[PDB]
Scaffold this active site. Structure first.
Site, PDB file in Angstrom:
ATOM      1  N   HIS A 175       1.034  -1.409   0.074  1.00  9.18           N
ATOM      2  CA  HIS A 175       0.057  -0.326   0.494  1.00  9.18           C
ATOM      3  C   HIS A 175       0.901   1.206  -0.187  1.00  9.18           C
ATOM      4  O   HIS A 175       0.688   2.298   0.079  1.00  9.18           O
ATOM      5  CB  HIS A 175      -1.000  -0.098   1.079  1.00  9.18           C
ATOM      6  CG  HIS A 175      -0.668  -0.275   2.333  1.00  9.18           C
ATOM      7  ND1 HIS A 175      -0.618   0.605   3.755  1.00  9.18           N
ATOM      8  CD2 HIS A 175      -0.229  -1.428   3.154  1.00  9.18           C
ATOM      9  CE1 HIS A 175      -0.188  -0.146   4.486  1.00  9.18           C
ATOM     10  NE2 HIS A 175      -0.017  -0.966   4.763  1.00  9.18           N
ATOM     11  N   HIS A 189       2.034   9.131   0.709  1.00 16.43           N
ATOM     12  CA  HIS A 189       0.403   8.955   0.050  1.00 16.43           C
ATOM     13  C   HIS A 189       0.592   9.780  -0.840  1.00 16.43           C
ATOM     14  O   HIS A 189       1.709  10.957  -0.864  1.00 16.43           O
ATOM     15  CB  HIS A 189      -0.367   8.822   1.170  1.00 16.43           C
ATOM     16  CG  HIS A 189      -1.001   8.246   2.134  1.00 16.43           C
ATOM     17  ND1 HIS A 189      -1.388   7.324   1.764  1.00 16.43           N
ATOM     18  CD2 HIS A 189      -0.164   8.725   2.929  1.00 16.43           C
ATOM     19  CE1 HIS A 189      -0.815   6.727   3.236  1.00 16.43           C
ATOM     20  NE2 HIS A 189      -0.628   7.882   4.020  1.00 16.43           N
ATOM     21  N   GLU A 207      -3.619  13.131   1.497  1.00 13.28           N
ATOM     22  CA  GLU A 207      -4.830  12.659   1.838  1.00 13.28           C
ATOM     23  C   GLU A 207      -5.241  13.918   3.037  1.00 13.28           C
ATOM     24  O   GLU A 207      -6.492  14.330   2.503  1.00 13.28           O
ATOM     25  CB  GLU A 207      -4.460  11.950   3.432  1.00 13.28           C
ATOM     26  CG  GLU A 207      -3.573  10.440   2.488  1.00 13.28           C
ATOM     27  CD  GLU A 207      -3.782   8.929   3.279  1.00 13.28           C
ATOM     28  OE1 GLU A 207      -3.308   9.531   4.535  1.00 13.28           O
ATOM     29  OE2 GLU A 207      -3.843   7.986   2.930  1.00 13.28           O
ATOM     30  N   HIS A 216       4.181  11.066   6.403  1.00 11.38           N
ATOM     31  CA  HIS A 216       3.169  10.367   7.691  1.00 11.38           C
ATOM     32  C   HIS A 216       4.500   9.832   8.626  1.00 11.38           C
ATOM     33  O   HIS A 216       5.282   8.740   8.075  1.00 11.38           O
ATOM     34  CB  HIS A 216       2.085   9.437   7.291  1.00 11.38           C
ATOM     35  CG  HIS A 216       1.440  10.413   6.926  1.00 11.38           C
ATOM     36  ND1 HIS A 216      -0.093  10.045   6.699  1.00 11.38           N
ATOM     37  CD2 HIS A 216       0.798  11.743   7.129  1.00 11.38           C
ATOM     38  CE1 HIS A 216      -1.013  10.168   5.943  1.00 11.38           C
ATOM     39  NE2 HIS A 216      -0.471  11.561   5.920  1.00 11.38           N
ATOM     40  N   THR A 255      -5.403   4.534   6.737  1.00 17.75           N
ATOM     41  CA  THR A 255      -5.620   3.001   6.523  1.00 17.75           C
ATOM     42  C   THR A 255      -6.238   1.766   7.981  1.00 17.75           C
ATOM     43  O   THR A 255      -6.215   2.180   8.702  1.00 17.75           O
ATOM     44  CB  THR A 255      -3.828   2.189   5.721  1.00 17.75           C
ATOM     45  OG1 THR A 255      -3.330   2.653   6.870  1.00 17.75           O
ATOM     46  CG2 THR A 255      -3.562   3.201   4.470  1.00 17.75           C
TER      47      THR A 255
END
Ligand code: Q3K
Ligand code: ZN
EC number: 4.2.1.1
Length: 257
Positions: free
Chosen positions: A61, A93, A103, A116, A196
């Site tokens: 991911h 991301h 995000e 993050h 997530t």
């Protein structure tokens, strides 16, 4: 399993993780005019001088750099936090193009990517326990825009060819995450969740106002990673971001006027 596609993406996650529709989900749009300046918020304390990175991993991911969190070597304190939070890992991301990938959004503006840095409250002893608590985790969020290169990111970019597919990992020692921070530590903060699965409502979000700049060549290397395992049809790891979720009964607070 969950992912970011048409058939398994964010609008599907509530079926396996019903808290997806909960009261304190992340990310959110940060409306800069509605955020309240809280002059009682402390400056954030980032102590990464002794950080010990271990490995870099494609988890299907994102990619993450993991740190030794067996002692107080790289910790986050102060700000809106009570106590000490140990750095576990950082990841990103990003988008398929530079106009999406973050995000969090700022007055609906999307950034090309979002970093993050994930920390857990040492009073809970381990991250598994901490995710079960409303003050368990602190995630420091940093926006990326495309322009000048970020020299401190290059060591990361250069090993991504060796972790192309889900499950691959490599040694990633002596990486200094101080080279990923912007000049200012001014921030917005609000109570939220993992973005997530399992989407646990355990996070104090700390989102820095100032973005870092990365180069087009650096972000292009993120976009060469794969969601898939080796030997499966190649599906580029792009657009691995959850859209903004309803703010509901939450107040976003600003450290700065
Ligand atoms: N995008 S973001 O920064 O909001 C993501 C933070 C997720 C940090 C990972 C926490 C856990 B992993 B392992 B197990 B699975 B379940 B238990 B254990 B670690 B803790 C939890 B999940
Ligand atoms: Zn994340």
């Amino acid at each position: 399993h969950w992912g970011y596609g048409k058939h398994n993406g964010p609008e599907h996650w509530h079926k396996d993780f019903p808290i997806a529709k909960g009261e304190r989900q992340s990310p959110v749009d940060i409306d800069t005019h509605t955020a309240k300046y809280d002059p009682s918020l402390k400056p954030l304390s980032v102590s990464y001088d002794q950080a010990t990175s271990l490995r870099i991993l494609n988890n299907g991911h994102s990619f993450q750099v993991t740190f030794d969190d067996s002692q107080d070597k790289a910790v986050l304190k102060g700000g809106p936090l009570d106590g000490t939070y140990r750095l576990l890992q950082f990841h990103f991301h990003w988008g398929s193009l530079d106009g999406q990938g973050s995000e969090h959004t700022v007055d609906k503006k999307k950034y090309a990517a979002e970093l993050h840095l994930v920390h857990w409250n040492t009073k809970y002893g381990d991250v598994g326990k901490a995710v079960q608590q409303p003050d368990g985790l602190a995630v420091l969020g940093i926006f990326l825009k495309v322009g000048s290169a970020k020299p401190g990111l290059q060591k990361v970019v250069d090993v991504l060819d060796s972790i192309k597919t889900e499950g691959k990992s490599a040694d990633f020692t002596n990486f200094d995450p101080r080279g990923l921070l912007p000049e200012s530590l001014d921030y917005w903060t609000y109570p939220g969740s993992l973005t997530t699965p399992p989407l646990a409502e355990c996070v104090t979000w700390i989102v820095l106002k100032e973005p870092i700049s990365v180069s087009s060549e650096q972000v292009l290397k993120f976009r060469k990673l794969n969601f898939n395992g080796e030997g499966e049809p190649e599906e580029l790891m792009v657009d691995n971001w959850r859209p903004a979720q309803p703010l509901k009964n939450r107040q976003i607070k600003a450290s700065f006027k």
